Amino acid sequence: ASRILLNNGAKMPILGLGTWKSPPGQVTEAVKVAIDVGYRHIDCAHVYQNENEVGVAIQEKLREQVVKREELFIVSKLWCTYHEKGLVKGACQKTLSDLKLDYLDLYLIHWPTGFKPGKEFFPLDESGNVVPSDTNILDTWAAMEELVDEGLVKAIGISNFNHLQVEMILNKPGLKYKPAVNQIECHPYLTQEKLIQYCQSKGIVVTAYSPLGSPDRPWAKPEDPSLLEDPRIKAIAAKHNKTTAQVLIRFPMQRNLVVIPKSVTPERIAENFKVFDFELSSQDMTTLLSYNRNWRVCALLSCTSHKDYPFHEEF
Numbered sequence: 001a002s003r004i005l006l007n008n009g010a011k012m013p014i015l016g017l018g019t020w021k022s023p024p025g026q027v028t029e030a031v032k033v034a035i036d037v038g039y040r041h042i043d044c045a046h047v048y049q050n051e052n053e054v055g056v057a058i059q060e061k062l063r064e065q066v067v068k069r070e071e072l073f074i075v076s077k078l079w080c081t082y083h084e085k086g087l088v089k090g091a092c093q094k095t096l097s098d099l100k101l102d103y104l105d106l107y108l109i110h111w112p113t114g115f116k117p118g119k120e121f122f123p124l125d126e127s128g129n130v131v132p133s134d135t136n137i138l139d140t141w142a143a144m145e146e147l148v149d150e151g152l153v154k155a156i157g158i159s160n161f162n163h164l165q166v167e168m169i170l171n172k173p174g175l176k177y178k179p180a181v182n183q184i185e186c187h188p189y190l191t192q193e194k195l196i197q198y199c200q201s202k203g204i205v206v207t208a209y210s211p212l213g214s215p216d217r218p219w220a221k222p223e224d225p226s227l228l229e230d231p232r233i234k235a236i237a238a239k240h241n242k243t244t245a246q247v248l249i250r251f252p253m254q255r256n257l258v259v260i261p262k263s264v265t266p267e268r269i270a271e272n273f274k275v276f277d278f279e280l281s282s283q284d285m286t287t288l289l290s291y292n293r294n295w296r297v298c299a300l301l302s303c304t305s306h307k308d309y310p311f312h313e314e315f
C-alpha cells in the first residue's frame, strides 16, 4: 500500500522525495517531475536553504490542478537554532511562507540538540565546538504541540532522537500529542533494529533517511563503504531485474518504514518511484540486514559534546 496510518489519524505516503543538497536552481524542476510521476510526499528543511524553490514547484502543480493540496504530504523540520519556545512559531511560519503553504502535514524537531540562536546555523566557539542553547527537548516539544493547536501543522514528530530521548517525550509530564514520526538514518549499513522496534511498538512511524548512503554528502571519503557499489546488493538487484537503488528503497518499505530518497535527476526520480511492482523475499530482507556495520552519514564531529548528542547511547 502507498500510505501508512499515523497516530494523528492521517495517512503518510511511504515514498517521499528528499531535498537535502538539491541545488536551488534544479530542485524546482525536480519536484515538478516528481509530482508528475507519482510522488505525493516531499521532505524539506529550512536548513537545506531551498524551501523557496521547492515551494515554487508545489504551487505550480497546485495551480495547474495536477494535484490537490489534500493529496500532498509536505514535511519540514525546525532547525537547532530555533529550539527556544519564543522562536518556534516564527521558524515554522518562515518555512510555510517559503513553501507557499498554509499548513505542513508534518513538522519535525530536526535534531534533539538546541544551538545558540542567531543567523549562523552552526554557531561555533573559537575551537570549533558547537555552541549549545540551554533549551531542553521537553519545552521544545510543548512548543511543537502549540503549532498543532494553532493549525499551522497537522502532525509533529522528531528526528535523530535515540530511544531514551523518544522515551523522554513519551514520559513527558502533561504530554498532549505523541510524536507521529521519528526520522532517522537507516540503510543496510545502519539497520537500526532496536530503535525501529521501540518506535513501532509505541505506534511511532519511522522514516528512513539517506537510504542510498548519501553519495553526494559533502564529507564523503574514499575509504567509506558504498551501498550503491556493494556487489552483494548489486547481486540481489540483478536477481530481481531492478537497480541497486530500487532494492535499497524497497528494503525499508518492507520493514514498514517511510523512505525518502533524494535526487535532482529526472530519470532517477522516476526510477526511484518504480518500487511498488516487485518484492524482496524474507531471505533477501534478512540478508540485507546482515550488512549492518553501524556506519553513519550524519553525525557531525563539532556537535559531539552537546549534552543531548544522541549517538553515544547504544540506541
Ligand SMILES: NC(=O)c1ccc[n+]([C@@H]2O[C@H](COP(=O)([O-])OP(=O)(O)OC[C@H]3O[C@@H](n4cnc5c(N)ncnc54)[C@H](OP(=O)(O)O)[C@@H]3O)[C@@H](O)[C@H]2O)c1
Binding pocket: 017, 018, 019, 020, 021, 043, 044, 110, 159, 160, 183, 184, 208, 209, 210, 211, 212, 213, 214, 215, 216, 217, 228, 243, 245, 246, 260, 261, 262, 263, 264, 265, 268, 269, 271, 272, 297, 298
Ligand atoms: N532528518 C535529517 O537529519 C536528515 C538527514 C539526512 C537526510 N535527510 C533527508 O533524507 C533525504 C535523502 O538522504 P540523502 O540526501 O542524504 O541521500 P540519499 O537519498 O541516500 O542519496 C542521494 C544521492 O543519491 C543519488 N541518487 C539518487 N537516486 C539514484 C539512483 N536511482 N541511482 C544512483 N544514484 C542515485 C543522488 O544523485 P542525484 O541527485 O545527482 O540524482 C544523490 O547523490 C535528504 O535529501 C533529506 O530530505 C534527513
Ligand SMILES: O=C(O)Cc1nn(Cc2nc3cc(C(F)(F)F)ccc3s2)c(=O)c2ccccc12
Binding pocket: 020, 045, 047, 048, 080, 110, 111, 112, 113, 160, 297, 298, 299, 300, 303, 304, 306, 308, 309, 310, 311
Ligand atoms: O540535517 C540534515 O538533515 C542533514 C545534515 N546533516 N549534517 C550532519 C549533521 N550532524 C548533526 C548532529 C547533530 C547532533 F544532534 F548530533 F548534535 C546535530 C546536527 C547535525 S547536522 C550537516 O552538517 C548538515 C549541514 C547542512 C545541512 C544539512 C546537514
